[PDB]
Design an enzyme around this catalytic site. Structure first.
Site: not given
Ligand code: XGK
Lengths: 273, 10
Positions: A20, A89, A96, A135
């Site tokens: 990412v 987005e 996190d 998940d």
């Protein structure tokens, strides 16, 4: 062409989210997250409404991509010879929920209530759209620190929601239910509720309750932190060994511990700013 | 303090 619509930046989170990268849409300077998935490593495939063959992750992301701020929004995708590229987005600033809990420890119940409620609404949105995430865990939840809004990410283990039994699973084992450990069989909603019990314990105790298979199937929940009796009751109900003994999402959200939730903006002002 | 870690899915 991907490289023309987006200025590509450096790797995000040093690979912890997968491949990412940071990006900005040249059209309007919109911040994006650019996720790459290798075709060779993709297990489940599906078809888009038109019929094109794409990773299941893209199918599920497209299905939930309508407006609700509780799930990450897929803005576009591209196919390459050996991979698919997903434009997601990118809220900012974020942390996190795994890192948030590590840094802050066990969360105040008012804050856990606000976060848990938002996760429940996001998972309900998924199920309403025909998507099972499979998940749910703190690592797959992003906190918008300015707006106090949580985002569910990483549909790479998900499936179309069905009412019949699942016999495959590739999510996180320490969030998986005892019927999966024991029998390699589960139904989607009640397995999701189990993972939500693990998540709620994680929030109010500062780490997940079970590490080993024998703990998952054993049916004992020890509280390592002061937790109210109402919250303990909800957690133990979500963590019922038999799936039919677990609450529905309606029963969770009508539980006494879930009442009088803070608004997202209130949550940010009290707890995040 | 206890050992808290991430867990891969995959
Ligand atoms: O769906 C997924 O698998 C997925 C993964 C990662 C992200 C976002 C990561 C992120 C955002 C902003 C940052 O500043 C740093 C990291 C969104 C979705």
């Amino acid at each position: 062409p991907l490289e023309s619509q987006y200025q590509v930046g450096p790797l995000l989170g040093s690979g912890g989210f997968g491949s990412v990268y940071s990006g900005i849409r040249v059209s309007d300077n919109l911040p994006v997250a650019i996720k790459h998935v290798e075709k060779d490593r993709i297990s489940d495939w599906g078809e888009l409404p038109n019929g094109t063959r794409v990773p299941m992750e893209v199918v599920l992301l497209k299905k939930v991509s309508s407006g609700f701020s509780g799930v990450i929004r897929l803005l576009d995708w591209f196919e390459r010879p050996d991979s698919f590229v997903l434009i997601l987005e990118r809220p900012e600033p974020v942390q996190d929920l795994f890192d948030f809990i590590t840094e802050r420890g066990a969360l105040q119940e008012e804050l856990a209530r606000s976060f848990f409620w938002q996760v429940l609404e996001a998972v309900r949105h998924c199920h309403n759209c025909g998507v099972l995430h499979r998940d749910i865990k703190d690592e797959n939840i992003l906190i918008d620190l300015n707006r106090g809004e949580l985002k569910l990410i990483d549909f790479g283990s998900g499936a179309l929601l069905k009412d019949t039994v699942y016999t495959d699973f590739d999510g996180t084992r320490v969030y998986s239910p005892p019927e999966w450990i024991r029998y390699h069989r589960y139904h989607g909603r009640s397995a999701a509720v189990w993972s939500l019990g693990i998540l709620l314990y994680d929030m109010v105790c500062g780490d997940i309750p079970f590490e080993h298979d024998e703990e998952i199937i054993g049916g004992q929940v020890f509280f390592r932190q002061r937790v109210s009796s109402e919250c303990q009751h909800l957690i133990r109900w979500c963590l019922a060994l038999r799936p039919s003994d677990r609450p529905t999402f309606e029963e969770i959200q009508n539980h006494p511990w879930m009442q009088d939730v803070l608004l997202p903006q209130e949550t940010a002002e009290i707890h995040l700013h | 303090a206890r050992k808290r870690r991430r867990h891969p899915s995959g």
